Structure formats: structure tokens, C-alpha cells
Write an enzyme that holds these catalytic residues in place. Sequence first.
Site, mmCIF file in Angstrom:
data_model
loop_
_atom_site.group_PDB
_atom_site.id
_atom_site.type_symbol
_atom_site.label_atom_id
_atom_site.label_comp_id
_atom_site.label_asym_id
_atom_site.label_seq_id
_atom_site.Cartn_x
_atom_site.Cartn_y
_atom_site.Cartn_z
ATOM 1 N N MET A 237 -19.797 -2.533 70.261
ATOM 2 C CA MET A 237 -19.890 -2.732 71.668
ATOM 3 C C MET A 237 -18.396 -3.282 71.955
ATOM 4 O O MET A 237 -17.884 -2.707 72.881
ATOM 5 C CB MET A 237 -21.084 -3.940 71.842
ATOM 6 N N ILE B 208 -25.956 0.538 68.481
ATOM 7 C CA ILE B 208 -24.777 0.039 68.556
ATOM 8 C C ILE B 208 -24.726 -1.589 68.667
ATOM 9 O O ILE B 208 -25.387 -2.315 69.192
ATOM 10 C CB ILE B 208 -24.041 0.347 70.116
ATOM 11 N N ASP B 209 -23.962 -2.151 67.444
ATOM 12 C CA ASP B 209 -23.997 -3.394 67.145
ATOM 13 C C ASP B 209 -22.904 -4.206 67.740
ATOM 14 O O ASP B 209 -22.188 -3.566 68.719
ATOM 15 C CB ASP B 209 -24.015 -3.676 65.641
ATOM 16 N N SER B 210 -22.630 -5.524 67.555
ATOM 17 C CA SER B 210 -21.713 -6.193 68.330
ATOM 18 C C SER B 210 -20.256 -5.713 67.981
ATOM 19 O O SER B 210 -19.613 -5.559 68.910
ATOM 20 C CB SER B 210 -21.705 -7.612 67.952
#
Lengths: 146, 436, 601, 80, 150, 36
Positions: free
Chosen positions: D43, D38-40
Site C-alpha cells: 500500500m 495488498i499489505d502495508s
Amino acid sequence: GEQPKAWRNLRFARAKMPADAVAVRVVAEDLSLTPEDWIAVTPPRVPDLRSLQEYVGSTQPVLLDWAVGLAFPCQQPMLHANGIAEIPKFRITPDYSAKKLDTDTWEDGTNGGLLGITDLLLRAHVMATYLSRDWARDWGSLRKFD
Amino acid sequence: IGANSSDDGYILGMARVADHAGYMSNYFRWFGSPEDPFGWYYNLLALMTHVSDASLWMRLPDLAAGLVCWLLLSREVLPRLGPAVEASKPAYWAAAMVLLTAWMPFNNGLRPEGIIALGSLVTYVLIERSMRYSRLTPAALAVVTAAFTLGVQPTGLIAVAALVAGGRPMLRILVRRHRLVGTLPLVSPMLAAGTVILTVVFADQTLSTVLEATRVRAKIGPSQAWYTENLRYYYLILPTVDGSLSRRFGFLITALCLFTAVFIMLRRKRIPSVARGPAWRLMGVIFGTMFFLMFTPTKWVHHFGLFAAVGAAMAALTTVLVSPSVLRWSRNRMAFLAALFFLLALCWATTNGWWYVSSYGVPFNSAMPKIDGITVSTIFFALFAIAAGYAAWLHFAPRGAGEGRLIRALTTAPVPIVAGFMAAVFVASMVAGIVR
Amino acid sequence: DTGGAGADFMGIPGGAGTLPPEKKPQVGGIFTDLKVGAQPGLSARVDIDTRFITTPGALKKAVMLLGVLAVLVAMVGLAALDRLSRGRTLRDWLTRYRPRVRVGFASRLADAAVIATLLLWHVIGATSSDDGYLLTVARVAPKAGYVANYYRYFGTTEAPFDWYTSVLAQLAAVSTAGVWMRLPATLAGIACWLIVSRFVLRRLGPGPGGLASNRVAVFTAGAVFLSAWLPFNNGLRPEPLIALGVLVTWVLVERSIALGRLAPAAVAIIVATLTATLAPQGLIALAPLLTGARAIAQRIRRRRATDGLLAPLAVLAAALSLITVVVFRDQTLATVAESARIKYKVGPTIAWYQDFLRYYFLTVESNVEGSMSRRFAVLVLLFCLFGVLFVLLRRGRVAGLASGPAWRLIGTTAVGLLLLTFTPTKWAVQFGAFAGLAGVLGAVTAFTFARIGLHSRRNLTLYVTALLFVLAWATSGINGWFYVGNYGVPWYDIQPVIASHPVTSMFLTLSILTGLLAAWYHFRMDYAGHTEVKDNRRNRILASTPLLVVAVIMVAGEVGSMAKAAVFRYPLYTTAKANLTALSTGLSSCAMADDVLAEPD
Amino acid sequence: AATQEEIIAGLAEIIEEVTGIEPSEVTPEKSFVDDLDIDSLSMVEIAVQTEDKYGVKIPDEDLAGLRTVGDVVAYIQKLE
Amino acid sequence: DPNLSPEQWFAFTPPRVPVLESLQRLIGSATPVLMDIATAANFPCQRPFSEHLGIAELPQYRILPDHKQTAASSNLWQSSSTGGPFLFTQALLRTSTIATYLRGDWYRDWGSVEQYHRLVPADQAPDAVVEEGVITVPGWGRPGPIRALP
Amino acid sequence: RSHRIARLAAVVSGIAGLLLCGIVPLLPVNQTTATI
Ligand SMILES: CC[C@@H](CO)NCCN[C@@H](CC)CO
Ligand SMILES: [Ca+2]
């Protein structure tokens, strides 16, 4: 009208001019200076107009095109028995566009067809025909073989 | 009072000269070559011409075929897609009206499209009857029917689709009967039945003669390849007589319903009282028909008259699948209505032309209808735009926006109404051509 | 003059005469036969039209500046509103918190293989039809005073769609070679692939599952992108720019939906209205805005207690009404209306109810415009569209692929194919605006049919027979290019044959046999199972590479034909020798005017 | 709405809707960056879509300290 | 010639070994040319004729594509009833033909070249001295239509 | 209050940018003439 060089036999209905009309006369103008905008005329005449079931009988061989067979159900097409065909007397054809695009190319002589026989010994020529009250409608044609 | 086909003088002239020649010749194009891998049906018109060659007497088979098609459709096919297609008036009216508007422009002349459309339905009926009592006799008569339908015309390569459709629940009968009485008295009768059309095909001609006729017809005549199938649909969207507002509707109203029933039966697996499986064989038949129509030598628009008896049964199914009881959200029903309006706008964007002598007097035979300076396709496009605007508004709406009686009423049966309006237009054309 | 054309011998009663206003002459000089002095009363005064040679003026240059200043200030205010709504303090303006994620070695190896091919095809390319048209228009525009058509329509302008020709007119002043004027069409393919591989495949399934970790679903995307880009986008035509504008709009709309912001959704409108004025087929760039509009209305109505319902709509309208500054920088409304009237009255236009003779122009007999490798790029597009549509209707999930982005991608493609109806021209080269979407659709298809076709055998066989049927359709047209790309190509006038036998039947028989085997599995499932296909290590990569192989052999067949032509006919003229001779020797070399000999007397 | 009856039963649905990750593998012991991917962007999309169901402001200067999915449990429990 | 059909004959002429020169040395990248739509990306040194102040400059040569391309597209796209350059390159000029070959490839039907001669020589029909000015017009006014009729 | 300013700078400069860029095609322009 869209074929401006065709010897096209213009027609004027007698029932439109009054009852007591003594004479008529032709009037032509040609006000255009283009070399391909010209005019040509012959005197007026009153045709005699017999029928087609009375001129073409019910026993003479006729070459009916494949589009005109259900409207002429009494005309006795030409037969063939042992490879030998019969020699027709007339030919019945659809209107201009249909005859030019469909029937003359479907049954021409280079792909079998019946117009490969009648082109070598018959020498057709067209006749003057009208519809009984649709003076501005093109029903087809009627040729005579000599 | 109705119009006729284009190939009427053709068949009449080649049937009037076939008792003197001694064989069924073509007489018009090829080098006197017969048509005898096919054409056992023209030997019946050759016999009928002995009484008289009138127009009311020569097109009696094409009337009996349509009457029998309706009798089979309304009584063996519709009370089979469940207790919801039957016990429903809009479905019966949709079937009737689509059958009429697909049988009117195509299947009135002497062409055998109206007989192929009946032989392709008797096969489906006999197979769906075979797989109901686990019997093999109707499944042996369906093979005879399919053979005798193929022996009529090259485009008669349908009811093979009807044989292939009912193929999986027929193996359940073949297998479970193979355990009772051997295996030879199951492939002997269905071989003798399938290989009996040869005694009717080669009853006059021989093998070498059929081969020579085929060679000539293939080397000379118009014989397109399978990958040139798009010509059949290109000829349909041109503003000519070969594709007009009377010859577009029959196919467009079938394609629309066929493509909108698939999207609903894919998402909704189980629909109450629709009897899944016959509803899928009914679409398999149409898809197989459109696939087998690809391997035919000639790509004409006349061959769209075969969908007159399966399209009529597809409209009756779609009329139930898009009803306010199966399609519950107003946005979807408004979208279907907008699609119908778009189809109408596309259909009315051409001439009202008929064939050789059927065009004498009909109003808009050489131009677009154009009521009061503005065309009619523009009016149907305005209606489509309004319906699509309302559907788009219902997209951005709290799930209960359009539920009044007005849009609940005008979305209960749009297909019967559209098809009845079109049939009334067709009848008014010929009546106004007779009066004036 | 207008409304009248006459003559009048003054002192004569019957000399006068007048005609309708369409009896106006066609002045090309004044050729008398008089030869008499310079008497008073003998004269002539012609007024040339010159109505498209306008220049802005005092106003229309201060308003054309205040407008863009106001638009920028509005968008900055909307961005500040966006930053305030997410708990920020508009002082940590874009300070990242989570660390950067790297790029795998399989995703850095498809870039090196796609960019290398896009660079190689820039030298041995095909040079599509409308290259001389645009090159001549761009060479003539500087001196004429405006962007004229020069070949048709009575010297009328191109007022709406002429902001790309005004850049070509700047490039055609440095040099007019072929490797220099076709640079935007290559940079817009390099960027169009980088955007895809870096954003779109990670927006669709960003997890330990697939579509970002599956390596075959990246090579499939690369191969399908190449097979859809090579046959269409190599000239000066503006399709390579529309294909990039569509993806940029999709990316900005997805960023706006994800982050919960509205400023990227207001830049997407600017980019969409900028792409819509490249050509009448630029409406495709307005499809992502239509698909992702309910998810934007939900956001606008979610945050309307802090701000209002007028603050975001004012900006969303001001951004839409900014394209006027670029369209009417000159050529006021009157001249644009006149140009449109002329182009509709003269010239070939097609009505909306004949929108379906665009798939007929593609699949027709010889027609190098509907050649092989042009049918493939479209049939694969339709195949991968409808396959994923069906697999999403049935079984709503894919379990490894996010469904929001996937549904919006399907919607974008479908709405684009439906909006192509209202274009005035229905050529077959206008299918090159889907090259960016073809790659991602091929990747998604290769990913889904690898897991829904591993728990059965009839599905795995239907996949292969459908691919073989598409190949049978594709390999039935000639392998031809436009005018000089045909110099040496293997089958440039006949359809592919192996030994006097066409291949379009050798593929149809295989399709029929494979369909029969699929039916056999369908029947046999009544006495056995169908999920018994064990996925140990070999069956894993055997259901994910039926499309990769086909696309690779098609790209290799497109590249090897031109390479074989160039290498085999030498020193004979070919469109690669011209480019490789213009690359060396500076950029000054006449391409074909030096291999053509002439006999003056 | 206290713990483990919606705290995971809705988070494992939001995560599946956003990333396609199956809910069978959403358990409160594994972190977003380590087990999941899960990247920015993901998120922030999760933190935005969890504000529409159970309206609770999760600012951007806050999800920097939610390392594991159990950390979201502890945080939203502190809010409760 | 043994065939007796009325359309079989050939009417030849004596042979010659031509003296050839490049097309870049013939035209020269400084004279006005009328390249067609197809043959305009392959000749990047030859320059097209300009159109300054609504008045065209008469070309001196013309480069065409092959026969199947010229008969189908180039002759009926740039017509005079549609506004192309044939509007005035057919009412003011007279065309000829030049024998051109493609070096090394003697089987190839590329294009053709044609020369243009004035109908009225420029020693008695010189060019115009067209004036020039400037006005200010609003953005809604329209001074009648352009005669865009066939 | 850093919210009122950011809300007014999106309405005022949105209406102004909508009304200024909407009258550009209707403003006077300089045209050249030609007479022989
Ligand atoms: C161009 C005429 C076409 C039909 O439109 N004729 C088709 C041939 N008609 C068949 C019998 C209907 C031949 O057997
Ligand atoms: Ca005259």
C-alpha cells in the site's frame, strides 16, 4: 643455472676479450659455508667445433625425438619393415625441460615407445654441442649409442 | 616468416617412415599400432614427401585451406545474414582480422585442424545452399563432406553440428519431396553416400586390427573422460607456452562475441536487415561444436583452431549488432567497450612464447611484457576501469548524456581495431626475431 | 640492528665486517661453550619485536565513543526527516494502520522441516576444514595479547578480519566442545531461512497469484536452501555470517526503496561494511547496494526541496566511515599495513587474471574439496540464475512475479559472482556465501518454468533434460568429506556405482534421450500444435516439481550417508558419537583422545 | 485526466509494476484487502509511486481510509 | 620371498601382544601439545602451547593427521621458511614416534603421535627472565620491516 | 519549526561523525616492550 649439480660446461666467447690477449686463468671463490654450496673446476680449453651435418651424415640412422623432426629435415630417421626395427647411431633431443617432461615420458618403454628398445642394447652417452652464435641458448642435445 | 605448431616433427617423422613399413604407423608411442580408423590425410603427406620434405612445400595444404576458407566466408556466408552485414566495411574487416589472428598461432603446422575447419564450413555452406532451392543434392554432398571430415581426426566430430543445425528446414524439403518420388530413392542415395568412408578407412587394415589398435590406445594412452572437459580451459589460463597471449585471443574474442550476440537477439526479436534464422543457425553451429568437442579422447589446447572460420563469421555479425544503429543507448556501447578492455587485460597477462624453434629471438618469450617496469595488463585494466566509470556515470544520466561525436566515433568498430592491433603484434614478433 | 649486521674485533685492523640487513640471525637462545665467571664486558641484550601488543590509551577511547554517539544522533535525525516527509507529525512514530496478515499452513510446515534438519545436522554434521585453525587461534588469543595466526606468517596479526575470532575467543572460555563452538553457524542458518520465508518470497509476488500462494515454490526454496547450506556451512568458518549479512542488506535496501525512506538504506551500509570485514570474500555484501543505487539516487533527488543534498549524504558517509572504530580498536594503521605486506609477500595468493581456477577446483577428479553435493549446489545456482535471466530478457514479464525485485535479485547474484574476482584466495568452500540466494532463485525458477512450460512440450522437455545433464555432471565426483566425516560413508573414494557401473553415464544416456524427444517435438510442431497441454489437475503439478524431486533426493543422500555411517559403525569412532557423548555427561568429554590407544614402551 | 481515462489506466499499471497483479483484474468495485492481497508495504509503495507520476501528496494518515480502488477514485476526484 | 627384483624384501621382527592405554591418560590435557590444523577439532581437551610476550613455549608432543594429509598440507603449511612453529620446533627439539591404534578399527590410518626431547636439557639451559615495560607510539610510525624472508 | 532542527542534527552530527571516526587509526597507542 637452476640445476646446480650438472657438469655444465661454462663457455666464454673469444670475440669479447681484446685481439692481442696472451693468456687466461681461472678464478674461483666459494665464500659460502653451507654444506650444499660448493664449486668444482677443470682447466680451460679451446674446442674444435665441426658442424653437425658433417659429423652426422645424411645416411646414418638417427633417433629424432617427436619435437625435433621439422628442424632436421635431412637426417634419415630409423625405419622398420617386418616388426624388426633398425639400430640407430645417434639421438637428437629437445632442451632440458622439454626432454624431461614431454619426450622421455611420451615414448618410454612401459607404454610402447622407442626408448624400450634402445635402453636394452645401446648404452647412450652425451656429446658437447653449441649454437653457432647463441652461446647462451640451449638448443637440445645429441647422444651417441655404443 | 611465421611460426609452426608442436606436432610438426611428429607427423613428418611418422610420414617419412610409412612407405617402408607398408602402413601408417604411429612409430613413437604405442606398440607399432597404426592409426587407421582415422588418418586418410597422412597418406597424402606420405606421398608429398616423395618430392621433398622441405618446410615451404610440406605446409601448402594448410595455406590453400586458409585461402579457400576466406573465399567461402567472404562470398557465401556473409552475404547471407542480411543486407546489413554485407554493405558494411567494419564487418568485413572484423571477419578478416579475426580469421587471421585465429589462423596464425594454431593452423600453420602440419596438424589437420586447418583442414577440419574447412570441411566444417563447406558442410554449412552446402546445407544453407540446399535449403534455398529445395534441392536434395547439396544435402547429399554435405553428408559425404561430414564423413570425410570425421575420418581425419577424432576431433573432427564437427560438421555434424553443421548437419544438426540445418535440420528443421531440411525436413521441409525431405517431406515435400517424399510426396513426388516415393521414399526409397531418398534414403538409398543418402545411405550409400554416408556409408562410403568405410572403403577408405578399411582400405588397408581390417576390422580386428582396428579393434586391437583401439584397445591398446585406450588402455594405455592419454584418453580422458567426457566429464574432464574443464582441463582444456584450465590449460589455457596458465602462464606457459601452452596458452600465451597469442593462443588466448583467438578463443576469447570468439567467446565474447558469441555471448554478446545472444543477449541482443533474445531481447530484440526482429532487427532490421539482419535476416534472422541464419543468424541463429550460425550460433547453433558454434554451440554444437563446443558440445561435440567434449567427447574427444584428448583435451589439448591445439583444438581451439577449429573456431577460426566460425568465430570470424561471428565477429562480423556482432560488429553489426553492437553498432550505433542497432544498440541505441550509449551505456550499452560503453559497457561493451569496457568488456573488450577487460578481455584484453586478461589476454595480455602471460608470456609471448612460441614453440620449439619459433621462439628464437622474440622479445618477451619467458616473462610478461611489462613496458617500463609496469605490466601491460595493468594498463589495459586502467583503461577498463576508466571505460567502466564512464558507463556507470551514463547509468545515472538523463538518457541523452553521451551522444557527441567522440564516443560515437570510438564505438563504431572496436573489434576490427583490436584484432588488427593484435595481428600487427604477431607479425612484429617474428620480424624482430628474424632481424636480431 | 635494522640496516646493518656486523662484527668488529676492536684492536685488530682486519677484524671488522658488515653485511646487508637481511643477514640477521634467528635467535632461539644463547648457547655458549665458555664457562668463565661474570667478567665486565661480557653481556648480551636482545630486544623482542612485540609490535602487535598495543592497547588504546587515554585518547582513541574518547574519540572512539564520540564517533559512535555522533553517528547515532545523525541516524536519528535522518529518521525524523523520513517521518516528516510522509505527512506524519513525528508523534505517531510507527503506529500501524493496516491489520497484520497471517502465514499459511504450507509456510509454517516448511519451517518445521528446515529447522529440524538444521538441528539434526548439527549433531551428525561434517565439520569442514578450517575448524582446528580457528579453534586453536581462539584458544591462544587471550594469553598472547592479540589475535595471532600461530601457524604461519611469523606470528603476525589478522588485523582487519579479526572481530569474529574475538567472539570465538569468548565462547572458547566457557567450553571448547564441538556442539558449543558451532552454535553461531546454526543460528545464522535458522535466521537466514526465517528472513527468506517471511520477507523475500512475499516481496516477489505479493498477490492472489504465485510465489507466495504457490506451495511447491516454497518447498523448492526450502530444499534448495538445504542442499546449498549442508555441504558448505557447518564449521567455524565465517561463511554462515556472510550468507546472512547479504540477505539483511538486501532486505534493508528493498525496504528503503519500497517505503520511500533513507534510514534503512543507511543501516544497510553499516551492515555491509560489517560483513565486509569478516573475510576478504565479504565484498558480496556490497552487491545489493550497487544494484539498488539508481532507485536510491532517484529518491535522494526527489526530496531535495524540503531538505537539501547535504543532509542525506552526510549521514550516508558517516555510516560508511564507522567501521574504523571496529577495525582499529587496537592495531593502528602501521601494524595493519605491515600485516598485509607480510601476508602478500609470504603465502599463497592468486592474481585477478586467474579468477577462473575457482570453477576448476570445484569440478576436478577426486578432490574431496570438489566432491559430489558440492558441485550440485553450484550447478543448480548457475542453472537457476541463467534460466530466469533468459526468461526475463525474452518476454519482459512473468505475470505473477514483481519485476523490480526480481531484476535486483538477478543483479545482486551476478555482481557477487563478478566481485569474487578480487579475492586473494580462490578456494572452493567460498561458494557457501550464496546459500541464502540459492533458495529464492530456486523458488523463482520453479515458479516461472511451471507457466512458461505449460503452453508447450519442447520447453517442458528441455527443462528435464537440463536437470538430467546437471545430475550427470554432479554424480561424477566422489562422495567424500574432510578427514573424519569419511569414516563409513558409502562412496568416499570412488564415484557412485550401482553394480560396477557408474551412474554418471546412466544419467547422460537419459539426458540424450530426453533431448532427442525435445527435438522430436520441435520438428513435429510443423504439422500440429504445441499449446494443447490441458492443465486440468494432474499436469498442473507435474511441470513444477522436476527440481523439488532432485533437490530432495540430494538432501536425503547427504543426510542418509552420515546417518548410515553413524548407525552402522558402532561403537567404532564417528563424528556423531563424539557429539552425542558430549551432549550427555555435561559437556566434558575428550572426543578422539579416548578412542585412540597408545603403546608407550 | 478527469476520470477513468488515467484514474484506472495508470493505477492498473502501478499496481502491476508493484505487485505483479495483472491489469485485467483491476476494476473499481473490489477492495485491496478483500479481492487483491495488498499489505502495508505494498500500500505504501503504491502511494509513493503514484506521487511521482501525478504529483499529489498522499500522507500515511490518509491511505487508511482508501478501502477499495474506487475509494482512490473518489479521493483523487475530490482532490481534482 | 621368491621375487628377484632388487626392491622386493621385507625384513620383519618378532611378534608382541602390546599393552595399550588411552591417549588421554598418556598426554593428559595439561602438557603443551602441537596439534596440526586437521587434528585440532577432534582433540578438544589437549591444550596448545602458548606464546606470551613474543616468546613461545616449547611443546612436548605432536599430533599429526594421516600420511596423505601430512605429506600434502601439514608439512608445507607450517614450514620454517613461511613462519610456522617448525621455526623453533626443529632447531631446538628432537622428535620420536609412538605406536598408536584406533580402538576397534584396525584398518584405519588415522594420524600419528610423536614425542619431543630437548637438544640441550633444561638443567643447563633454563628459561629466560624476559623483562617488560610500556611505551607510547603514534599510529603512523613503523620501525622497519619484519624479516619475512625464506 | 521542527524541520530546521532535524535538518541540522543530520549535517552537524554527520560531519562530526565522519571526521572523528576517520582519525581513529592514527591516534597514539600503548605498546609493551620486552628485553632479555
Ligand atoms: C604430447 C604430444 C601430443 C601432441 O601435443 N602428441 C599428439 C599425437 N599427435 C598425433 C598426430 C598429430 C598422433 O596421431
Ligand atoms: Ca662452501
